[PDB]
Design a protein around this ligand. Structure first.
Ligand code: HEM
Ligand code: EIA
Length: 390
């Protein structure tokens, strides 16, 4: 069994994935838990994500392949399949739908401008990670959920604990307990003090309409907050890094910003974001895949970043092509667990790029590229700091 995940080298795709796609699904050994099959070929990853025989509900209570000593538990979206998953996801679908996040575009741009203001007042160099990439999406998801602004820093502390693959399990357990107690309290707060936020609407669904249990309500609230805190914070930094090291792309995006959506989709395809955050499904029946047979009860993991460079699906897959047309990337997943945050994340990435490139037409690295440091032993690829001048 191949040790997994591979040690990250920046945002580079590990060269071993090229050979992996051309063979049968490989046996992998994670740091803890069951061994598993690893699927990398685009068609094979799509099959795992669409075939109901590969189940996240079946993973609960198993010795899951994972990065941490203790296995995940829960009642929410990452733990269920239809029809239970559907009842939960329908309650969040309105707020995360493209139609309902689009009105946030102006607020997101105002926030970006405010953050860029503070970078200007503070003087060069700025750090795009601490000064922009972290605050912008964390603020937004807090506003959508109805999380009070004063708790930003406390919640980012928790996010840093979750983001480290190396967090000692006692600390992870005590901060975990306190985070859940905090969210229990917020759910009480939104029932006494309703608002036009998602957690208020989810509290109604639980405690007035009996549509979800208290366990399901708390699971969804915690899942949505954590995912919102750890995903786009790192991805914004990664996209600015790739744009800065491909400067020949910046003048088109600055002058003709209607080109930014397609570039965001290409960068979504290209960038390996999630590493330690990888869901393991368990097969509920025997399944033939890639010339091998995945037995009932065995575990399967996917590598979306590898599938996203499969030469049968993408022309010139190893090149960053910012106007790429045929781009059916799996950067947000597929099937019933397709990223519920995709429209919000997309909007944030688009706005970040539009605002920063307009406000800072001379933006460039403030250190040599060799002096950049990537986060180590993280669950998500990202930079520790991104020093820029302008
Ligand atoms: C660029 C940022 C993001 C990327 C690359 C990303 C990626 C993904 C991927 C690949 C999956 C599918 C995983 C699988 O099926 O194994 C997924 C699911 C999910 N993501 Fe996103 N995500 C991002 C941002 C977000 C945001 C902002 C939120 C919440 C506000 C979010 C919440 C979720 C949830 C709750 C699911 C599970 C949905 C379900 O099971 O029904 N993600 N994400
Ligand atoms: C952006 C999309 C991401 C998404 C973002 C955040 C979530 C991840 C972080 C949540 C909790 C956390 O780490 N610690 C608290 C208890 C530790 C316990 N021990 C584990 O092993 C374990 C997990 O593995 C959890 C994985 C969660 C899957 C979620 C991720 C799925 C991806 C597609 C536990 O919950």
């Amino acid at each position: 069994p191949l040790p997994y995940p591979f040690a990250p080298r920046g945002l580079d795709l590990d060269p071993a994935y090229a050979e992996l796609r051309e063979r049968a699904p490989a046996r992998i050994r994670m740091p803890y838990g069951d061994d598993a099959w690893l699927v990398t070929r685009y068609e094979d990853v799509r099959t795992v994500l669409a075939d109901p025989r590969f189940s996240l509900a079946a993973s609960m209570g198993r010795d899951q392949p994972r990065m941490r000593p203790v296995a995940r538990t829960g009642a929410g979206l990452f733990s269920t399949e239809p029809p239970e998953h559907t009842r939960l996801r329908s309650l969040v679908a309105r707020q995360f739908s493209a139609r309902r996040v689009e009105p946030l575009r102006a607020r997101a741009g105002q926030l970006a401008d405010e953050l860029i203001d503070g970078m200007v007042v503070a003087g060069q160099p700025a750090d795009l990670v601490e000064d922009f990439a972290i605050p912008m999406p964390t603020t937004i998801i807090c506003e959508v959920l109805g999380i009070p602004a004063k708790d930003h820093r406390m919640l980012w502390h928790w996010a840093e604990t979750v983001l480290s693959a190396i967090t000692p399990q006692e600390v992870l357990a005590t901060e975990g307990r306190a985070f859940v107690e905090y969210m229990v309290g917020v759910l009480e707060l939104r029932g006494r003090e309703p608002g036009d936020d998602l957690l208020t609407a989810l509290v109604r669904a639980c405690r007035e309409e009996g549509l979800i249990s208290e366990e399901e309500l708390l699971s969804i609230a915690c899942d949505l907050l954590i995912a919102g805190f750890v995903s786009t914070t790192n991805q914004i930094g990664n996209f600015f890094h790739q744009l800065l090291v491909h400067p020949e792309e910046l003048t088109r995006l600055r002058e003709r910003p209607e080109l930014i959506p397609k570039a965001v989709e290409e960068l979504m395809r290209y960038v390996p974001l999630l590493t330690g955050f990888n869901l393991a499904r368990y097969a509920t029946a025997d399944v033939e895949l890639g010339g091998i047979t995945i037995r009932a009860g065995e575990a399967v993991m996917i590598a979306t970043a590898a599938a996203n460079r499969d030469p049968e699906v993408f022309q010139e897959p190893e090149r960053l092509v910012m106007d790429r047309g045929a781009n059916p990337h799996i950067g947000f997943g597929h099937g019933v667990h397709y990223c519920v945050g995709a429209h919000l994340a997309r909007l944030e990435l688009q706005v970040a790029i539009e605002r920063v490139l307009h406000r800072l037409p001379g933006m460039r690295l403030a250190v040599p590229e060799s002096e950049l440091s990537w986060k180590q032993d993280a669950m998500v690829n990202g930079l520790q700091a991104l020093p820029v001048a302008w």
